[PDB]
Amino acid sequence: GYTELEKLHIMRDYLLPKQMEEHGLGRDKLQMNEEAMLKVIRQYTREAGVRNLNREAANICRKAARLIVSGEKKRVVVTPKTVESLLGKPRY
Amino acid sequence: GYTELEKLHIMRDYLLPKQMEEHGLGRDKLQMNEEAMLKVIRQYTREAGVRNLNREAANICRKAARLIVSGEKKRVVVTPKTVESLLGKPRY
Secondary structure, three states: OOHHHHHHHHHHHHHHHHHHHOOOOOOOEEEEHHHHHHHHHHOOOOOOOOHHHHHHHHOOOOOOOOOOOOOOOOOEEOOHHHHHHHHHHOOO | OOOHHHHHHHHHHHHHHHHHHOOOOOOOEEOOOOHHHHHHHEEEEEOOHHHHHHHHHHHHHHHHHHHHHHOOOOOOOOOHHHHHHHHHHOOO
């Protein structure tokens, strides 16, 4: 159904912003780059749609908010590097 | 299957502790009384098991951690009172 690029746009424009508000993360609080999103789409997801993608997005917010309440840091930034240390080894 | 007293123990000793851990909440951060738990069991839960119960516990944790990062509070205390403010109208 959705191509990677389609899913990327959905995660960037809809899924992540929604989860972020759902976990009360402002944008000074969480940042995630397109490379990172793309990564989780491919390694951590196989599906026509975005159900798991949204699920993974939620996981990322929860685990980010885990870091602020509490630990290091105060603002979480998600690179393809930090993805691993948040969701574990790539599934795919 | 589970009597409501049974669900209370599972809720108290198990579901909420697990969820608190999953949202990175210490005891100094989220406090929840038994009256509250019982409330969510009775007023927000039609089930034999603890599936939705666990889901409501997760919701409470998420909404709690939302408040620490950031807003109102540094620690959240859940009374029957403060249940609406996290969960709304008792689905009963």
